[PDB]
C-alpha cells in the first residue's frame, strides 16, 4: 500500500512537471496584441411564458428554432422561438426533473432528475400523442445531465459518480464510465461525438472516450465543485463553471488551464456555461439573477444580459449563433440577440 | 398577417396554456412536505400507518386527511450530496424530521446516533433555503426509551445531564436540547410531538401544523404578515 501510494505521488509530480514545462506562454500575453471586443448589447426579443416553477434545463434543436425546457412543475414544453408557440406539452410522471436533452434529429427528447430513471419520449409517434418510449433504469443516483450521442445510443450521468452509455434499441448500459470521486454534474459532447468531458463535485474534469470507455485525460484547477462544462466549438478545448465564482478554460492538447475568468464583485457560484458559434464570446449564468459575457481571449466582461427575476440556471446558443436563450428559476425563459 | 396554419398553431398554444394553468391551479391545492431522518428513526412505520389511514430514488406518498391533500416526498434512499439538490424543495410547505429517541446509547459504525441526528437537524433547519420552512419533529421510539431508561441511564449519552432519572425529566431535557438548535426562531417555529402506538394523533398534529403554516402563508401573501 505504501509503495503504491509513493508511485502515485511520483506519477502526479511527473505529470505536474510535464504540464508546467509546456507553459511556455500564457494566453493573455498572446491575445494582448489584438484590440479588445466592444460592449456587447443584447436586447430581449421574446419572453417564453407558461412555466409555473423553476427552470432547470433547456436545449436547442438542430434547426436553431425549436427548444425544449424542463421545470420543477413536471411539464416539458417545446417552444417555437420564432412565434413563441408551444409545440408540445409533455406531463412528466416525476416532477423533480433536473436535466433535459433534444435529440439531433428532433424525433426524441430525454430528461431526468431525482427519479434515477431517464425517460425517453418520442415526438414523431403515429398515434399523435407524446408517449414515453423507453425508461432507462439502473442508476443509483439522480440524473445530473444527459445528451444524445446518436439516434441509436445515448449517454447519461447520474449522481453515483459514474456515467453509463445506454442503447435505445437494447435498453442496457454497454459502457460504464467510472473514476469520478465527486458527483458528475454536467456533460458536453464534442463536435465529432467521439470524446466528451464531464465535471464533478471533486473540482476536476475528465475527458472520456465513447468506443474505448476509459478516462482519456483528467483536468483540475477549480477550488470548488464544477457546476457547468461546455466544449469549445473547435473541439480541442472546453470551459468549466464552478461555485468559486470563476470560469476556467482547459485545452485537451496542452493538458492545462489556458485562462481564468473572475472578478472581485462576483462572489456567487455559476450555474451554466456555453460558447458561441465562433467561440469569441463566452456566456456564464451566475447566481445573481443575471448572466455575464466574457472575452474568450482577454477575459474582459464584453457585456451582460439585463437579467431575470431569479437565479439563472441554464442557457444555450443556437447551432447557427443567431440567438442565445437563458433559463431562470423565475419560471421565465428569454432569448437574446 | 398570420396564415391559416399560424392561427391554428396560436390557438393550440392558447389551449395548451389554458391546460397548464388548470393543472397548476389543481396542483397548487395539494400540500407539499418533505420527510427526513435516519432509516432506523421509524419513518417506515409512519409511512405505513399514514397509508393504512388513507426502486432506487425518492418515494412520493399521496394521502388526504380532513379534505386536505398532502404530498410527502422521501429522500432517505438518495444517498448523495444533498446541498446540490436540496434546493429543489425550497417551495416545500413543511419538513417531517423523525429521530430515534431510544437510540441515545446506540453506536453508529458522529459515533453516537443522537449527535449525528442533531447535526443533520441543524444542517437542515439553518439551511439557507429553509429559512422559513417549518419543521415537524416526531419521537417514534418513546416506548423503547421508557423501557430502556429504567435499566440504562441517560448519563452515558449526555454526561453533563444531572437531572432525575425519571422519563418525564429526560424527555423534557431532550426536547429542550433539540429545540435550542433553531437559530431562526424569529422567522420559523418547530412543532414537536411524541409519536405513540396511536396513529390518528400524529396525522392530526401534522394537519394542525400544516394549517398553521397555510394560515401564515396566506397572511404573508396579502401583505398582512
Amino acid at each position, epitope marked *: 500500500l505504501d509503495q503504491l501510494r509513493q508511485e502515485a505521488e511520483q506519477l502526479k509530480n511527473q505529470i505536474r512537471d510535464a504540464r508546467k514545462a509546456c507553459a511556455d506562454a500564457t494566453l493573455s500575453q498572446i491575445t494582448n496584441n489584438i484590440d479588445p471586443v466592444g460592449r456587447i448589447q443584447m436586447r430581449t426579443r421574446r419572453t417564453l411564458r407558461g412555466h409555473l416553477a423553476k427552470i432547470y434545463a433547456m436545449h436547442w434543436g438542430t434547426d436553431s*428554432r*425549436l427548444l425544449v425546457s424542463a421545470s420543477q412543475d413536471g411539464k416539458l414544453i417545446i417552444w*417555437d422561438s420564432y*412565434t413563441t*408557440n408551444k*409545440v*408540445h406539452a409533455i406531463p412528466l410522471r416525476s416532477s423533480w426533473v433536473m436535466t433535459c436533452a433534444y435529440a439531433p434529429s*428532433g424525433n426524441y427528447v430525454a430528461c431526468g432528475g431525482l427519479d434515477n430513471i431517464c425517460s425517453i419520449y418520442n415526438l*414523431k409517434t*403515429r*398515434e*399523435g*400523442n407524446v408517449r414515453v418510449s423507453r425508461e432507462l433504469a439502473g442508476h443509483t443516483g439522480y440524473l445530473s445531465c444527459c445528451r444524445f450521442l446518436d439516434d441509436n445510443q445515448i449517454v447519461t450521468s447520474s449522481g453515483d459518480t459514474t456515467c453509463a452509455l445506454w442503447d435505445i434499441e437494447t435498453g442496457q448500459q454497454t459502457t460504464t464510465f467510472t473514476g469520478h470521486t465527486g458527483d458528475v454534474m454536467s456533460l458536453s459532447l464534442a463536435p465529432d461525438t467521439r470524446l466528451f468531458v464531464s465535471g464533478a463535485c471533486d473540482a476536476s474534469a475528465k475527458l472520456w472516450d465513447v468506443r474505448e470507455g476509459m478516462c482519456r485525460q483528467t483536468f483540475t484547477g477549480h477550488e470548488s465543485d464544477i457546476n457547468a462544462i461546455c466544449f469549445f466549438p473547435n473541439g480541442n478545448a472546453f470551459a468549466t463553471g464552478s461555485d468559486d465564482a470563476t470560469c476556467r478554460l482547459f485545452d485537451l492538447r496542452a493538458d492545462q488551464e489556458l485562462m481564468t475568468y473572475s472578478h472581485d464583485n462576483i462572489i456567487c457560484g455559476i450555474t451554466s456555461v456555453s460558447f458561441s458559434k465562433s467561440g469569441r464570446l463566452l456566456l456564464a449564468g451566475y447566481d445573481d439573477f443575471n448572466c455575464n459575457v466574457w472575452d474568450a481571449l482577454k477575459a474582459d466582461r464584453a457585456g451582460v444580459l439585463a437579467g431575470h427575476d431569479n437565479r439563472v440556471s441554464c442557457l444555450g446558443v443556437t447551432d447557427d449563433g443567431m440567438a442565445v436563450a437563458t433559463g431562470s428559476w423565475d419560471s421565465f425563459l428569454k432569448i437574446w440577440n | *398577417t398570420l*396564415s*391559416a*396554419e*399560424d*392561427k*391554428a*398553431a396560436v*390557438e*393550440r398554444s392558447k*389551449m395548451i396554456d389554458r391546460n397548464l394553468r388548470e393543472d397548476g391551479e389543481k396542483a397548487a391545492r395539494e400540500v407539499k412536505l418533505l420527510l427526513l431522518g435516519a432509516g432506523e428513526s421509524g419513518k417506515n412505520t409512519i409511512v405505513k400507518q399514514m397509508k393504512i389511514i388513507h426502486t432506487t430514488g425518492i418515494v412520493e406518498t399521496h394521502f388526504t386527511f380532513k379534505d386536505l391533500h398532502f404530498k410527502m416526498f422521501d429522500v432517505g434512499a438518495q444517498r448523495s450530496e444533498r446541498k446540490k439538490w436540496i434546493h429543489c424543495f425550497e417551495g416545500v410547505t413543511a419538513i417531517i424530521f423523525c429521530v430515534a429517541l431510544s437510540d441515545y446509547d446506540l453506536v453508529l459504525a458522529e459515533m453516537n446516533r443522537m449527535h449525528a441526528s442533531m447535526k443533520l437537524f441543524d444542517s437542515i433547519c439553518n439551511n439557507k433555503w429553509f429559512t422559513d420552512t417549518s419543521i415537524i419533529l416526531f419521537l417514534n421510539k418513546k416506548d423503547l426509551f421508557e423501557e430502556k431508561i429504567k435499566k440504562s441511564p441517560l448519563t452515558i449519552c449526555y454526561p453533563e445531564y444531572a437531572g432525575s432519572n425519571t422519563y418525564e425529566e429526560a424527555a423534557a431535557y431532550i426536547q429542550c436540547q433539540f429545540e435550542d438548535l433553531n437559530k431562526r426562531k424569529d422567522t420559523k417555529e418547530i412543532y414537536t410531538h411524541f409519536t405513540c402506538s396511536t396513529d390518528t394523533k400524529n396525522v392530526q398534529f401534522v394537519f394542525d401544523a400544516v394549517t398553521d403554516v397555510i394560515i401564515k402563508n396566506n397572511l404573508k401573501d396579502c401583505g398582512l404578515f
Partner: single-chain antibody, 230 residues
Framework: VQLVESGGGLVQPGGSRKLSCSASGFAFSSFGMHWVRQAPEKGLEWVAYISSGSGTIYYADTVKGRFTISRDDPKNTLFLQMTSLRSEDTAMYYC??????????????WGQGTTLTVSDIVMTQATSSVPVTPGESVSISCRSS???????????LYWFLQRPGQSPQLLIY???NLASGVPDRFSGSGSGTAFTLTISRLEAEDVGVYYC?????????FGAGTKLEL
C-alpha cells in the same frame, strides 16, 4: 389510426341525414377534422372544419349555413348534420385528420368515407391524363392563381394520391417535406405559383389520381386531378 364513417344511401332532396364518423387509434382530441366530398368523376372539395376543442369552426361558401358540423371529444365521434341536400351534394364524404404545429403534416390520414346519394384560390393542372410506362420519370405541373408562398418563408402546397378503391394519401406537404411512409421517389418543387411534382420511376402502386391542394386560405380548393396509368 382508423376512421369508420356511417350513414348515407339514397336520400331525398328535401330530406336530412346525419353522418357519423367513429375515430380510434389516436388522440382525436388534439387533432383537427375536415370533411372532403368527391362526386363521381370529379375532384375533391373541402366541406367544413373543426379545430381542436371546437374552438374554431369554418364552413365552405357552397355549404355555409346549410350543413352543421359538430365534434364530441369525450366520445371521439364526428357528426355532420345536413338539413337540406341538393342534387349536386351527392358525393363520398371523407373524414381527414389535421394537426397544426411547426413540422406537422396535416391531411396525412384519410378515412374510408361514406357514400351519400340524392334522388377563392383556383388550382389548375396542365395535363390530366399522361400515359407513361413504368420506370420512366413523370412530371406533373401545377399552377395557382395566387402565390401560395407566405411572408414567413414557406409555401402551403399539398399533394394527394388517390388510387382505385383507396382514399387519398398525402405524398408531400408544404412542397418541401416528404410525408412519412411515402417512398423517396416522389419529389416536389415550385417557384411562387408554378409547382411541379416529379417522380423518379413510376411503379404499379403509383397508378391513381394526383390532387393538388393549397392551404394558404382556409377555403381550401383542389385541382382537377392528374390521372396516371400504365
Amino acid at each position: 389510426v382508423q376512421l369508420v364513417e356511417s350513414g348515407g344511401g339514397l336520400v331525398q332532396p328535401g330530406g336530412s341525414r346525419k353522418l357519423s364518423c367513429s375515430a380510434s387509434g389516436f388522440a382525436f382530441s388534439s387533432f383537427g377534422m375536415h370533411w372532403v366530398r368527391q362526386a363521381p368523376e370529379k375532384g375533391l372539395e373541402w366541406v367544413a372544419y373543426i379545430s381542436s376543442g371546437s374552438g374554431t369552426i369554418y364552413y365552405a361558401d357552397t355549404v355555409k349555413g346549410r350543413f352543421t358540423i359538430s365534434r364530441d371529444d369525450p366520445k371521439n365521434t364526428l357528426f355532420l348534420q345536413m338539413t337540406s341536400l341538393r342534387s349536386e351534394d351527392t358525393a363520398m364524404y371523407y373524414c381527414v385528420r389535421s394537426i397544426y404545429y411547426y413540422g406537422s403534416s396535416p391531411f396525412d390520414f384519410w378515412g374510408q368515407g361514406t357514400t351519400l346519394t340524392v334522388s377563392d384560390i383556383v388550382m389548375t393542372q396542365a395535363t390530366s391524363s399522361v400515359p407513361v410506362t413504368p420506370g420512366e420519370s413523370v412530371s406533373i405541373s401545377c399552377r395557382s392563381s395566387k402565390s401560395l408562398l407566405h411572408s414567413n418563408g414557406n409555401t402551403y402546397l399539398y399533394w394527394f394520391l388517390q388510387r382505385p378503391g383507396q382514399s387519398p394519401q398525402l405524398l408531400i406537404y408544404r412542397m418541401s417535406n416528404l410525408a412519412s411512409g411515402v417512398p423517396d421517389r416522389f419529389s416536389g418543387s415550385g417557384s411562387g405559383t408554378a409547382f411541379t411534382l416529379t417522380i423518379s420511376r413510376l411503379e404499379a402502386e403509383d397508378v391513381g389520381v394526383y390532387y393538388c391542394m393549397q392551404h394558404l386560405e382556409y377555403p381550401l380548393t383542389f385541382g382537377a386531378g392528374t390521372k396516371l396509368e400504365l
